[PDB]
Amino acid sequence: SWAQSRDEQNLLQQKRIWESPLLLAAKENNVQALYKLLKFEGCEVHQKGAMGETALHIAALYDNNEAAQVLMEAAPELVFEPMTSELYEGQTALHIAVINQNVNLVRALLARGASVSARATGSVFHYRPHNLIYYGEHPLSFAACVGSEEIVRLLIEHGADIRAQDSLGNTVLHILILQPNKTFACQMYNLLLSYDGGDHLKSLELVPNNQGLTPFKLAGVEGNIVMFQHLMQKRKHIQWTYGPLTSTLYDLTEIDSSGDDQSLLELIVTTKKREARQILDQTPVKELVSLKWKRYGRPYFCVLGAIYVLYIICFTMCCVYRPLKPRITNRTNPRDNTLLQQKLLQEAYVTPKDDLRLVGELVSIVGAVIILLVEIPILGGPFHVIIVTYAFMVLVTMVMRLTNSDGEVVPMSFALVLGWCNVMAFARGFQMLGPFTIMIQKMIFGDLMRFCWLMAVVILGFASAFYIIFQTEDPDELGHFYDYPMALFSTFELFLTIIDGPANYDVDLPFMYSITYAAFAIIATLLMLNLLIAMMGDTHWRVAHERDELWRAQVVATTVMLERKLPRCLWPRSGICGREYGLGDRWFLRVEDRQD
Amino acid sequence: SWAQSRDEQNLLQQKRIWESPLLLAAKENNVQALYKLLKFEGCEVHQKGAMGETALHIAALYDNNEAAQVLMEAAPELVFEPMTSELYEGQTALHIAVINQNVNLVRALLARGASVSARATGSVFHYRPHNLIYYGEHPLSFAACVGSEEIVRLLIEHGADIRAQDSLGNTVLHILILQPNKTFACQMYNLLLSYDGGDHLKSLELVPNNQGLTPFKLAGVEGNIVMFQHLMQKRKHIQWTYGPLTSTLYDLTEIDSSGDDQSLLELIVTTKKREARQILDQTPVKELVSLKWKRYGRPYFCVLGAIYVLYIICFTMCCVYRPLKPRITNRTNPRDNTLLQQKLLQEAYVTPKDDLRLVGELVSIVGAVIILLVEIPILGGPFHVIIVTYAFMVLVTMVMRLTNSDGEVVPMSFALVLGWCNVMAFARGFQMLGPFTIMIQKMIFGDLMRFCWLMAVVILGFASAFYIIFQTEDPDELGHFYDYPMALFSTFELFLTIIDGPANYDVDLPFMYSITYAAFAIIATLLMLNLLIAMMGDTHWRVAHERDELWRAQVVATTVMLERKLPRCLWPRSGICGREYGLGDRWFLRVEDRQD
Ligand SMILES: NCCOB(c1ccccc1)c1ccccc1
Ligand SMILES: NCCOB(c1ccccc1)c1ccccc1
Ligand SMILES: C[C@@H]1NC(=O)N[C@@H]1CCCCCC(=O)O
Ligand SMILES: C[C@@H]1NC(=O)N[C@@H]1CCCCCC(=O)O
Ligand SMILES: [Ca+2]
């Protein structure tokens, strides 16, 4: 394991500190023990420890400016020494002094001429979940994350480049977005901005991440509202103040779907960050998408819904009327219990009333490949993998067609439950019953699978037990379960109280039926009542707000995909462009509000 | 009764105080009445009261230093006098002065040369639930429990032994753990430690209780978090401080399963203390068992689960296919209503397809005695008394086998509902549906038995009433209940709405059926609705946290038993031992955290 390797190496490091009297005197800050170990007896001052550290590195882990200065006066070359381990590859003595905010040592290390651009590419300095913090690689990134504004400027004064990026291409601004202390990071964020070039171009706030993210755009996908609101002040214009009213004009550039995929809107939808959903409730974004859905969002959705409901109600019209035959097969040849009148007609005759059937089938088959075409190239959708697999079923039904298989029904019967139950996805948005469907959507594809095993397991015993009892009995009277699958099915219906239970009084029931079914009834009811109380965890207030906050996000989810895949002839661009206006050729939204 | 004996003796004591003018003057602190009762008229100064108390004992129950000093100047032998009753056997006048924190009297009693090692073995000083407090037996234990630090040192200054134990072998540290004022007891706990011998061995914090508990270990089983966190500071090492990070190295000695049963982990599981469950959420213990379950805990659990599900699905495979016969018995000899084709085959023939059946039966019979073997030698388990009794049933089925009883089915049919429903115990841990199973586990074995009587009682009337009505009627048409057990069963199903009710319209029903069943339906529904509202007591927030805190404890419950009964070849010891490291040969866990 990797988690224990750093546990062992930390214990292994403390051994070498205790064994080496130099590293011990540099940990314990034993000043008089350093002179007797360097001036009188010439000990190895370049003594590398278990982590590739030096005596000065240990003199810095524990703030010991006295031991650090003795090690820097008798060996000034220790200042340039980086750690040479796998976990701490590249960390210098300045990194340790900046993290500990030892301003006296950082200023005394910078007087010794320490490197202000030493990358710390150790495996413990990575942006991984197993690492508690992530400050970056440069000594300037460390000063900015610890909030030590004195060291931030003290490092800039010695030639610190704010443009510097780490192995992930993150500037000193991208890292500040990924910090807990957000209220203090905005102050530090402005401190780093005051050292920019000053010109309007090649600014630091525009350097893109290696995954295509500016510091403004990274704050949106990550869900940093304190940095989102702070970075929004730099890109919004206040038109006028008229008493309480103040019509502010937001920039709207990286916020709208201007680029093919660099847009911030396209990032909030497709991200795994649960917290990023709260960005769209900010005032530059909420009234934007509010205007995107009321008009040109909801109508085109319903058209796609009315077409779909019309398409499915015509596809089902082709099912209720299918070929027919009074069973060309001879008699009940297999078993006497056979109720079959096989409906197989291979000939394309019956020309009167069958010509209309080909129209619906052609519509159903071109309307299905169209669904494949638009989907040839989960947050708020699930239901529409079902439509894609449905059109696969009508194609398999088409393969089952013109071959006249016995199972012409099975993919067809599959097809229309999916197609109608898919209409339920249109209830999203529309009205309040959308939040009801997504509670279902969360429950169907979420805990139904994991909960059914528990029921299947409890059903397993009682269902199989019943089969043992009635295997003796003649199934003519009370043949509720005569086969093993029939034993599990009749008990499955009995677990949901959709069957009256084995109730035969003309005969006498076996001894173990009344004992098992009494236990089964009581167990099956206690399973359902504790299940309802288990649903009360999603009942207090936040969950009613959580099912509503992700529904309104599920609507914005469906809204932006339409715009990307609908033609731009319809659906004009949001805002009023900055050309033919005293603006900078941007698009910009007018938003007026009132205060108290 | 014993509770009234101390009520009578307290009233009996006040009688002797009022009757005896000395004890009255020592209660009322009547100074001038003591001189006229001792110096002028020689009264019995050794006058024993109803509780074996002296005049000085009464002069101390009510802080009366004036009356105490007159009784100690005219009779200094009263200082050594203990109480000679059954309730207060051994209590001296110093105990009363220490409890009342009369520092002036304790210092004046210690000047008189009072005993600082007088055991108070009275029945009221016992650690029993009927006694409100429990401070111990020694006068030093009393000073430490009342927090009077002045008297604690004032008693030590006169030769008080901190090592002293009471009749339960509890030191002055073990008693401080069992106190309400925890925030003030830690200060007193350190005060008692500063008087130790100073050497690292034979310390007071290591003296074991008479039930094998050190003061550190007693705080865990009792659930004293304030003393657990306080006693943990003495056994955790801080490796380094790197800005926000601080990797502390906990001792991990009495916390891990080092001993056969002296471990603290093995005590939190098997204890009745409901509050001790919160110890495992403390930082030296929570991340410990978190690493014990994710690896080497959960996989071995599922292997035991996959084997069990495979073992049971093979045992049930032996049931669905059993011996067969088209009923060697003649006809429906007893009653015409008989649907029997008895399946009894005594011969071990049918060699083709029966040889495989013996393999499953042999597996099912060796897999059952194996279950007995591992269990030949309740918190978080219940479900697995069921597995033990199941393997008893397959043995009784084996006894029923090779004897060819009519009831070859009954223990077999019993066996497989238990065996499958036992799989539900594997849902513990695994995922979130574990908390659902334990809510069932609490409900099945908790209130189901006590609630059923109420239903059986309400069923009793309506079920028996129905039998009276339909005893007249010919049971051929609407014979829902023709027998007395059949009367209770059809009504039992009717109480859970698993039967359509006596619905026959070709005939005319008796007068009292429609009147009773209408009352039965309304009563049966009001029974179920008030039952669902009765489940809302376990719905507000703490219960959802309580069903979750004991589930996560139910997982740790199952985890430690595996380690004790699984071979040590697999499952390495937690931590990294202190040999080949600058440590004290302990094992120790590295735990790094971040602050704000
Ligand atoms: N492309 C798969 C369909 O999923 B739907 C969807 C896609 C992305 C985000 C949210 C929902 C959908 C798309 C258009 C109209 C209605 C629903
Ligand atoms: N020994 C009786 C079985 O009870 B189980 C159990 C025992 C102690 C604590 C918690 C649960 C159990 C043991 C091992 C695996 C699965 C469950
Ligand atoms: C062991 C290393 N040697 C040292 O002198 N400091 C390091 C320890 C503290 C740095 C930990 C950084 C982290 O955990 O992210
Ligand atoms: C009655 C006894 N006689 C006395 O002088 N004090 C006792 C009464 C108070 C002690 C009660 C201790 C307890 O209840 O635990
Ligand atoms: Ca019915």
Q: Is A137 in the pocket of ligand 3 (CB under 6 A)?
A: no
What is the enclosing helix (H) or strand (E) of B242? strand B236-242
Q: Which residue type does A575 have? A: G
Instruction: Sort strands A245-250 and A236-242 into parallel, antiparallel or unpaired.
Output: antiparallel
Contacts of range A200-204, beta carbons closer than 8 Å, 24 or more positions apart: A204/A162, A204/A163, A204/A171, A204/A172, A204/A173
Distance (angstroms) between ligand 2 centre and the Cα of B441 equals 14
Q: Do B436 and A454 touch (CB under 8 A)?
A: yes
Instruction: From the CA of B83, give the closest atom in ligand 4.
Output: 3
| Residue at token pair 């008699």 | A331
Distance (angstroms) between ligand 3 centre and the Cα of B194 equals 36
**Beta-bridge mates of residue A242:** A245
The dihedrals phi and psi of A23, each to the nearest 5 degrees, come to: -60, -30
Distance CA B438, CA B440 (A): 5
Widest distance between CA atoms in chain A: 116
Contact A205, A216 (CB under 8 A): yes
Chain A residue with the nearest C-alpha to that of B488:
A514
Please, is A94 exposed, middle or buried when counting C-beta atoms within 10 Å of its C-beta (0-12, 13-18, 19+)? buried
Query: Three-state SS for A239?
Result: strand
Nearest to A235 by CA among A221, A259, A214: A214
Asked whether residue B483 is marked as a ligand-binding residue, the answer is: no
Out of A271, A555, A561, A571, give the residue to mutate to test ligand 1, the one with the largest number of ligand atoms within 8 Å of its CB: A561
Instruction: From the CA of A132, give the closest atom in ligand 3.
Output: 15
Q: Which of B414, B417, B548 to mutate to test the interface with A (most CBs of A within 10 A)?
A: B417
Instruction: From the CA of B133, give the closest atom in ligand 4.
Output: 15
| DSSP code per residue over A245-267 | EEEEEE--SSSSS-SSS--SHHH
| Closest residue CA from atom 14 of ligand 3 | A124
Q: Is B288 left (phi over 0), alpha (psi -120 to 50) or beta?
A: alpha
Q: Do A62 and B247 touch (CB under 8 A)?
A: no
Closest ligand to the CA of A127: 3
* Residue A44: partners with Cβ closer than 8 Å, 6 or more residues away: A22
Distance CA B161, CA B150 (A): 16
Of A99, A473, A518, the CB nearest to B492: A518
Distance (angstroms) between ligand 3 centre and the Cα of A57 equals 10
Chain A residue with the nearest C-alpha to that of B319:
A468
Chain B residue with the nearest C-alpha to that of A529:
B532
- Helical pair A513-534 and B448-472, crossing angle rounded to 10 deg: 130
Distance CA B416, CA A464 (A): 8
Distance (angstroms) between ligand 1 centre and the Cα of A375 equals 10
Of B490, B581, B596, the CB nearest to A11: B581
Tokens encoding A176: 């500040």
Q: Which residue type does B142 have? A: F
Distance CA B241, CA A63 (A): 9
Tokens encoding A92: 């210098």
Contact A264, A284 (CB under 8 A): no
| Closest residue CA from atom 10 of ligand 2 | B558
- Please list the alpha-helical segments (H only) found in B78-130: 93-99, 103-111
The dihedrals phi and psi of A356, each to the nearest 5 degrees, come to: -70, -30
Q: Identify the DSSP state of A328.
A: S
Q: Sign of the CA dihedral A365, A370, A375, A379?
A: negative
Q: Determine what percent of chain A falls in helix, strand and coil, rounding each to the nearest 5.
A: 55, 5, 40
Other Cβ atoms closer than 10 A to B60: 31
Distance in Å, alpha carbon of B240 to nearest chain A alpha carbon: 7
In chain B, the N- to C-terminal Cα span, in Å, equals 59
**Beta-bridge mates of residue B591:** B248
Q: Which residue type does B63 have? A: D
Distance CA A29, CA A204 (A): 42
In chain A, the N- to C-terminal Cα span, in Å, equals 59
Q: Is A234 left (phi over 0), alpha (psi -120 to 50) or beta?
A: alpha
Please, is A170 exposed, middle or buried when counting C-beta atoms within 10 Å of its C-beta (0-12, 13-18, 19+)? buried
- Helical pair B410-421 and A448-472, crossing angle rounded to 10 deg: 180
Q: Which residue type does A194 have? A: S
B-chain CB neighbours of A467 within 8 Å are 320
| Dihedral angle computed from the Cα positions of residues A19, A22, A26 and A29, in that order, rounded to the nearest 10 degrees | 100
Distance CA B35, CA B287 (A): 70
Q: Do A11 and B500 touch (CB under 8 A)?
A: no
Q: Which residue type does A208 have? A: P
Contact A142, A175 (CB under 8 A): no
Q: Identify the DSSP state of B381.
A: -
Closest ligand to the CA of A268: 1
Distance CA B491, CA B470 (A): 13
| Number of CB pairs, chain A paired with chain B, less than 8 A apart | 187
Q: Which residue type does A377 have? A: P
* Residue A386: partners with Cβ closer than 8 Å, 6 or more residues away: A418, A421, A422
Distance CA B383, CA B441 (A): 8
Helix (H), strand (E), coil (C) string for A134-180 = CCCCCHHHHHHHCCCHHHHHHHHCCCCCCCCCCCCCCCHHHHHHCCC
Distance CA B376, CA A320 (A): 65
Distance (angstroms) between ligand 5 centre and the Cα of B498 equals 8
Chain A residue with the nearest C-alpha to that of B336:
A507
Instruction: Sort strands B236-242 and A590-594 into parallel, antiparallel or unpaired.
Output: unpaired
Of B417, B423, B489, the CB nearest to A465: B417
Distance (angstroms) between ligand 1 centre and the Cα of A390 equals 15
- Please give the order of strands across the beta sheet that includes A245-250: A236-242, A245-250, A590-594
Please, is B510 exposed, middle or buried when counting C-beta atoms within 10 Å of its C-beta (0-12, 13-18, 19+)? middle
Distance CA A87, CA B592 (A): 15
Q: Do B339 and A527 touch (CB under 8 A)?
A: no
Q: Is A583 in the pocket of ligand 1 (CB under 6 A)?
A: no
Distance CA A513, CA B417 (A): 13
Instruction: Sort strands B245-250 and B236-242 into parallel, antiparallel or unpaired.
Output: antiparallel
Query: Three-state SS for B594?
Result: strand
A-chain CB neighbours of B418 within 8 Å are 461
Q: Which residue numbers come right before each break in chain A (C to N over 2.5 Å)?
A: 377
- Helical pair A103-111 and A65-73, crossing angle rounded to 10 deg: 10
| Dihedral angle computed from the Cα positions of residues B485, B490, B492 and B498, in that order, rounded to the nearest 10 degrees | 150
Instruction: From the CA of A374, give the closest atom in ligand 1.
Output: 1
Closest ligand to the CA of B556: 2
Q: Which residue type does A222 have? A: E
- Helical pair B484-495 and B448-472, crossing angle rounded to 10 deg: 120
**Beta-bridge mates of residue B241:** B246
- Domain borders along chain A are 1-282+574-596, 283-573
Q: Which residue numbers come right before each break in chain B (C to N over 2.5 Å)?
A: 377
Tokens encoding A31: 């000043």
Distance in Å, alpha carbon of B498 to nearest chain A alpha carbon: 5
Query: Alpha-carbon Rg of chain B, whole angstroms?
Result: 36
Q: Which of B498, B530, B542, B593 to mutate to test the interface with A (most CBs of A within 10 A)?
A: B498
Nearest to A117 by CA among A99, A152, A141: A141
| Residue at token pair 């309040």 | A432
Q: Do A500 and B496 touch (CB under 8 A)?
A: no
What technique was this entry resolved by? X-ray
Q: Is A381 in the pocket of ligand 1 (CB under 6 A)?
A: yes
* Cα B165 off chain centre by: 26
Distance CA B387, CA B420 (A): 10
Distance CA A106, CA A116 (A): 11
- Please list the alpha-helical segments (H only) found in A445-540: 448-472, 484-495, 513-534
| Residue at token pair 């003199």 | A59
Nearest to A532 by CA among B534, B353, B532, B477: B532
Distance CA A303, CA A300 (A): 5
| Residue at token pair 């073997």 | B373
The dihedrals phi and psi of A587, each to the nearest 5 degrees, come to: -115, -35
Contact B365, B393 (CB under 8 A): no
Nearest to A319 by CA among A426, A405, A401, A389: A401
Other Cβ atoms closer than 10 A to B513: 18
Distance CA A173, CA A145 (A): 10
Distance CA A194, CA A188 (A): 10
Widest distance between CA atoms in chain B: 116
Chain B residue with the nearest C-alpha to that of A495:
B498
Contacts of range B410-415, beta carbons closer than 8 Å, 24 or more positions apart: B410/A511, B410/A512, B412/A468, B412/B319, B413/A465, B413/A468, B413/A469, B413/A512, B413/A516, B414/B390, B415/B315, B415/B390
Tokens encoding B219: 């705080």
Nearest to A458 by CA among B286, B278, B419, B554: B419
The dihedrals phi and psi of B238, each to the nearest 5 degrees, come to: -100, 110
Instruction: From the CA of B60, give the closest atom in ligand 4.
Output: 5
Other Cβ atoms closer than 10 A to A64: 23
CA neighbours within 13 Å on the CB side: how many for A546?
Answer: 11
Q: Do B437 and A457 touch (CB under 8 A)?
A: no
Distance CA B321, CA B364 (A): 14
Q: Determine what percent of chain B falls in helix, strand and coil, rounding each to the nearest 5.
A: 55, 5, 40
Of B239, B476, B497, the CB nearest to A14: B239
Q: Is A375 in the pocket of ligand 1 (CB under 6 A)?
A: yes
Q: Do A512 and B413 touch (CB under 8 A)?
A: yes
Distance (angstroms) between ligand 4 centre and the Cα of B143 equals 16
Number of helices and strands in chain B (H, E): 24, 3
Q: Which residue type does B17 have? A: I
Distance CA A293, CA A555 (A): 8
Which residues line ligand 4 at a C-beta cut-off of 6 Å?
Answer: B 13, 51, 53, 57-58, 61, 88, 124, 131, 133
Contacts of range A202-209, beta carbons closer than 8 Å, 24 or more positions apart: A204/A162, A204/A163, A204/A171, A204/A172, A204/A173, A205/A173, A205/A231, A205/A234, A207/A163, A207/A165, A207/A171, A207/A173, A208/A169, A209/A168, A209/A169, A209/A170, A209/A174
Give the resolution in Å: 3.5
Nearest to A280 by CA among A295, A265, A291: A265
Distance CA A174, CA A213 (A): 9
| DSSP code per residue over B429-482 | STTTHHHHHHHHHHHHTTTHHHHHHHHHHHHHHHHHHHHHHHHHS-TTSS-S--
